[PDB]
Amino acid sequence: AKLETVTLGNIGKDGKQTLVLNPRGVNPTNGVASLSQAGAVPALEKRVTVSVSQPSRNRKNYKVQVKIQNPTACTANGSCDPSVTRQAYADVTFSFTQYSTDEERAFVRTELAALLASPLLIDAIDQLNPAY
Amino acid sequence: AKLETVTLGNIGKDGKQTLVLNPRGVNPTNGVASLSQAGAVPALEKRVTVSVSQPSRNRKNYKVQVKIQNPTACTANGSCDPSVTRQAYADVTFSFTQYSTDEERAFVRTELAALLASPLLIDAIDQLNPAY
Amino acid sequence: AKLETVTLGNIGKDGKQTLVLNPRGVNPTNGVASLSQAGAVPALEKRVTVSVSQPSRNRKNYKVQVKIQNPTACTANGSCDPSVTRQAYADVTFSFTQYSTDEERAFVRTELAALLASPLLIDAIDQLNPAY
Amino acid sequence: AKLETVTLGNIGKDGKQTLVLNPRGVNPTNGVASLSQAGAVPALEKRVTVSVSQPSRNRKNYKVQVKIQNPTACTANGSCDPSVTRQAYADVTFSFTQYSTDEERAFVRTELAALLASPLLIDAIDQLNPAY
Amino acid sequence: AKLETVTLGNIGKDGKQTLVLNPRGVNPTNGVASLSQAGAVPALEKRVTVSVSQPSRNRKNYKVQVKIQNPTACTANGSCDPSVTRQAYADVTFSFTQYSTDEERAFVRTELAALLASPLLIDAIDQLNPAY
Amino acid sequence: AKLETVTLGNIGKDGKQTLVLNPRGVNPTNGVASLSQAGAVPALEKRVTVSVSQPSRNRKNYKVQVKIQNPTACTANGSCDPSVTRQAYADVTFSFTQYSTDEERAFVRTELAALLASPLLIDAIDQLNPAY
């Protein structure tokens, strides 16, 4: 996953928007990759970062974690710089056995995408209805 | 949200498998739909569970939570022992406030579908080649 | 009361408005039904929910409770998303004996509607005058 | 509010009964009108009481409270014993702030009159068939 | 397993009666679902109650249960409630180990319904006559 | 009243299979009518046993006890003689008072068969789907 700029799309309710994730770098002090759209004023921007966690003396498994930050930045007309008055997010953790293969890990990755793209979760997220 | 049979296509590293979930009833303590996999034993494998919390606690926010359970077998016995041994799994939480826009929630959802289609996230999971 | 969408009307001071209550679902963790108009941004919306309480080892009777939420959502022109700066409500509890019949329960239900629709309460609610 | 004789028509499961209340005086401790039912003994049955609180406590809000008392008899004795035994009742509170709009208060009131006319609330009370 | 309205038929001594079971939801502290009868008075109802339990450690097995059914109502010399005595009861549970087949489960369910219909039990139960 | 061979058709998931119980006399330990499946191995696996008792001094209630056993044997890798690994069964009882008669017994056993055949129990048992 050697970082490179990737444009993501089919975004939003209609699946029409795109976003661009430009690597900013990888933070060596915590094992976290970071890419963003824009970035002139980071507080106001959408960001995606990924942690890397390997098996260890105190870790039974390894992880890939994606942190998704989606702020809403507002200012009233007549004023200056906007500020974030909402922070929307997602927190995606993948966790796997050291004896697991690519196909099995991929099932979890693609099951997630296929299911989040399915009505059960589309409604759980857009309508926020109780499972029912 | 509303539960109905879910068919998930284009699954796995090849993008060729199909999974079928059966959301047949919601847990009274956790608000969790049991998305059983099709097949009496396979149902326990590749199982997913889903709950949508309400802003009923002093956080004043809510979370849509999907838990993906993918334990797998290693060589079942003639005694009808499934030999389930190893496991892959994921925890994905969304992680919004009460004033959030449905469109923004949709972006977060579709952005993840897009991230799961990108080498920046895929290589780190299927080939376990992290960001750099 | 198998939930279905119902339009309510003769609403407001003149008895002219209507509202639509679309089931969102029933929360199995607390026995509470929920329906609303709209819902894209739940904090800002009118909602009606109903609890169900049955006789028990620690309950002498059974109840039907209706919770009515009527927020006032405001933003100033030139800004963004409105927020609620008023929460108006009603809390309606019905409670009955296990030996009571439908007619008796209906008397309480229709007595309430007939009386809330009568000047004694119309003025108690719109004018907020002391009983006098 | 202002008290005068109240006639409530279209009462009961059939919508055919008429009740008559007599709001003849307000309780000095609770601010409660005694809406006596017509008839010296029937007055005690199907009795309703009403009070409008003022924002005189550190809540800075107020409540219109109506209490419906519908105890009923089972087979009076020749000794002139009314045999009142079983009871149906309701407590309805409105539950507004000092800055509320009269129109919004009217909506809450009329919305309840409308809810009491809907199967979503009726079936749960008259047939005791709750939401689902 | 959505606990929606259930209609039964072809029942009673001559197989000619019908019954609609109207669910009232599930007890939050007891996994058993309950379904209401057509009677107006709760104290007189013959409620159907149902549960599916799926244990892990402590039992490592599965259980499904239904509770049946009715107290007998009557009056004599004047009353208050036409009161009921439990007279007609049955209790059916299903039990099996983990990882069972759906066909195995189906046979136990269908075998019982067939056994109940069969003369050896349908007449033996009516008469309470041991089969020898 | 009499012991007889039982043929049960239209059973199993598809409602098409037939099971046959060969009579096996009486067990005078408990007054149990023992019947078992008509085959060399089913004789060892699959069986139904039944007893009926009048009230004991500790009941004032008649009892019917039906035990349905449908275990599955598996052949371990090294066995010649397969044995039961999955002991599936059902526990079926009835209880009636000393003043109950034919209709009380009839609606219970016929309502039970109707319940077993209902879509709620078909799904609750065959799939093990909780009624939520």
Author numbering:
A (entry chain B), B (entry chain A), C (entry chain B), D (entry chain A), E (entry chain C), F (entry chain D): 1 to 132
Paper text:
The coat proteins (CPs) of single-stranded RNA bacteriophages (ssRNA phages) directly assemble around the genomic RNA (gRNA) to form a near-icosahedral capsid with a single maturation protein (Mat) that binds the gRNA and interacts with the retractile pilus during infection of the host. The canonical ssRNA phage Qβ has a genomic RNA (gRNA) of 4217 nucleotides, from the 5′ to the 3′ end, encoding the maturation protein (Mat); the major coat protein (CP); the minor capsid protein A1, which is a read-through extension caused by a leaky stop codon for the major CP; and the β-subunit of the RNA-dependent RNA replicase (Rep). Like many other viruses, the CPs of ssRNA phages can also assemble into virus-like particles (VLPs), which are not infectious. Through a native infection without engineering the amino acid sequences, we found that Qβ CP can form diverse VLP capsids, including the T = 3 icosahedral, T = 4 icosahedral, prolate, oblate, and a small prolate form elongated along the 3-fold axis.
Recently, T = 4 capsids have been observed when overexpressing the covalently-linked CP dimers in ssRNA phages PP7 and MS2. Here, we have observed under normal wild-type phage infection, T = 4 capsids are also made, albeit a small percentage (0.5%) of the overall number of particles. The elongated faces of the small prolate consist of two triangulation numbers, Q1 = 2 and Q2 = 3. Figure 3A shows the five forms of the VLPs from the wild-type Qβ, each containing 240, 210, 180, 150, and 132 CP copies for the T = 4, prolate, T = 3, oblate, and small prolate forms, respectively. Though all of the 5 forms contain 12 copies of the pentamers, they consist of 30, 25, 20, 15, and 12 copies of the hexamers for the T = 4, prolate, T = 3, oblate, and small prolate forms, respectively. For the T = 3 and T = 4 VLPs, both are formed by only one type of hexamer. The T = 4 capsid has one type of hexamer with a θ angle of ~170°, defined as a “less arched” type.
